[PDB]
Design a binder for this molecule. Structure first.
Ligand SMILES: Nc1ncnc2c1ncn2[C@@H]1O[C@H](CSCC[C@H](N)C(=O)O)[C@@H](O)[C@H]1O
Length: 213
């Protein structure tokens, strides 16, 4: 429900997260690595948004992608992941609201998010009609993602939201990216969106984006 929007809920959830098992929303790395890894390079500077206590950041490292930075607005979970992953100095963790990324522009080659925009859109009354706040907060995040990516960078989003709900959010021309989609995971009911800066949206995608902005 809408309680997933508030940091207090997450700070409460993540007490003791350094000692508890990792937890992954909408699949772990195994469920989508066939889709994800061909889009990555070992030298890529990767930013993971709303990391929580997911094993994704660690799995990227074990898979040959050491340049990982992970952020979350729960300072509790950031401290916990710093402690849990103290054996992996390559991995960086910082407390941050993803609506304002405190990095200089063009600092990353890839940005990933799994279940974070879902938190921003949690509890919407009508899945077909996005509230003013839902539109604005998601647009803020996406603008920041585009800003911190280098030219030519990639943003990859993993969510339970199917394209007839989520494409309208990603299909804004000013983000400066193309948009592709694949399904994965449980009953092929999870959705992976690939955005490549320098590409263009289709007229279909732009028409959906025009529905909210
Ligand atoms: N505005 C915001 N800024 C930064 N983190 C946010 C945020 N809104 C929600 N979050 C974080 O987003 C996460 C949503 S749950 C997804 C967790 C993790 N990426 C996984 O794949 O399992 C939580 O860890 C929550 O604290």
């Amino acid at each position: 429900g809408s309680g997933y929007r508030e940091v207090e809920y997450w700070d409460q959830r993540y007490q003791g997260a350094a000692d508890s098992a990792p937890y992954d929303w909408f699949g772990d790395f195994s469920s989508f690595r066939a889709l994800l890894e061909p889009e990555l390079r070992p030298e890529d500077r990767i930013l993971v948004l709303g990391c929580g206590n997911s094993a994704l950041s660690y799995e990227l490292f074990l898979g040959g992608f050491p340049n990982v930075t992970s952020v979350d607005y729960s300072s509790v979970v950031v401290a916990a992941m710093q402690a849990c992953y103290a054996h992996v100095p390559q991995l960086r963790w910082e407390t941050m609201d993803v609506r304002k990324l405190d990095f200089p522009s063009a600092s990353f080659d890839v940005v990933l998010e799994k279940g974070t925009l879902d938190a921003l859109l949690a509890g919407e009354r009508d899945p077909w009609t996005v509230s003013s706040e839902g539109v604005h907060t998601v647009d803020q995040v996406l603008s920041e993602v585009s800003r911190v990516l280098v030219p030519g960078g990639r943003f990859i989003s993993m969510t339970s939201a199917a394209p007839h709900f989520r494409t309208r959010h990603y299909a804004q021309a000013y983000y400066g990216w193309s948009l592709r989609h694949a399904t994965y995971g449980s009953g092929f009911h999870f959705h992976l969106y690939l955005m490549h800066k320098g590409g263009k949206l289709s007229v279909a995608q732009l028409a959906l984006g025009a529905q909210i902005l």
